[PDB]
């Protein structure tokens with residue numbers, strides 16, 4: 318069937334990207350994994366690059382839907398926990414799909430569609446962050462220091478670079494078992510910290 | 514002469530990278546700019562990729578030497594200024610060589626030598642940051658909150674990603690005229706901010 322063969326292709330690709338990068342994975346490898354022929358592959362996708370775009374789109378929307386769920390239901394907690402739970406959506410969602418994350422970031426250089434997808438969602442997440450900061454200031458809990466959108470931008474770019482370094486075991490990187498605490502500290506201190 | 518023709522090659526390359534990426538720049542373009550023949554080019558460098566490595570090495574060492582100069586002579590100032598002056602070395606050095614910065618970051622994906630160069634200097638800068646944090650804690654000015662090396666790592670990765678986004682005018686990015694204040698705020702609040 319249609320959905321079924323498409324889903325097999327996507328599953329095969331996610332599995333193979335755990336062992337090697339996209340440039341070392343052939344359309345034949347994808348077709349063989351999904352139990353189809355090569356020209357049947359080309360009915361569902363034009364290129365192996367398109368398969369990666371679809372996988373990345375799935376993961377990014379997963380994160381975005383999780384964040385939306387959280388935005389609807391507040392945990393009954395203190396401000397530090399509020400931010401930890403939110404950053405954790407990204408830590409768990411992308412950390413549960415490390416191969417797709419790593420491949421997707423590398424594709425930003427060579428694929429205008431992948432760059433645009435990542436840009437679009439980063440803008441959305443920055444805007445949301447800035448809206449929460451603005452709410453915290455309006456209720457008197459956070460000081461009016463930097464422009465909230467500029468602060469949100471830098472904190473979100475920190476998380477993009479730091480999470481993906483950690484997941485890839487780059488040198489340098491924060492260890493994966495430390496990265497959530499590290500990021501939460503920097504978000505909380507910079508959002509709530511006053512000018513001396 | 515030897516140094517002279519090498520320097521012309523490097524100058525030509527830095528000029529051409531302002532207009533286009535390395536993949537659209539030929540060895541003939543480099544040789545023509547430097548007033549030499551193609552095989553004379555190959556006496557001084559093996560590839561256009563090697564030229565970029567040399568340019569990047571120059572810029573990274575420029576920044577590192579500037580930071581060393583600062584580490585020798587303290588400004589007579591408050592703590593926020595101490596960090597601003599130091600972050601400004603990177604803002605001015607890389608911001609004065611935007612084409613080389615942009616090309617060098619893109620080459621990290623395809624060049625093990627470029628990745629290793631950037632890794633080596635990031636480790637050095639992180640270690641230095643962490644040593645200053647540790648000094649600030651030992652004198653009683655900064656609280657003992659996160660592991661200083663993990664904090665330094667995330668702050669330095671923030672700056673890498675945020676500065677290069679700003680210089681490239683990426684969407685999203687902090688405007689270049691705002692990025693120094695934004696980064697300094699987040700470093701100062703996270704280094705000096707207490708646990709509530």
Ligand SMILES: CCCc1cc(C(=O)n2cc3cnn(CCO)c3c2)no1
Pocket residue numbers: 384399400403404407408411418439442443445446449473474476477480481
């Ligand atoms: C590979 C992860 C890329 C990434 C992570 C993040 C991130 O950690 N966040 C996006 C956010 C939008 N809102 N929040 C916290 C809101 O409480 C967010 C954190 N932004 O980009």
Ligand SMILES: CCCc1cc(C(=O)n2cc3cnn(CCO)c3c2)no1
Pocket residue numbers: 580595596599600603604607614635638639641642645669670672673676677
């Ligand atoms: C394209 C710039 C990449 C970059 C910038 C930085 C950076 O902003 N810094 C490196 C640092 C080492 N020490 N400091 C501040 C010390 O007072 C530093 C800031 N690290 O990597």
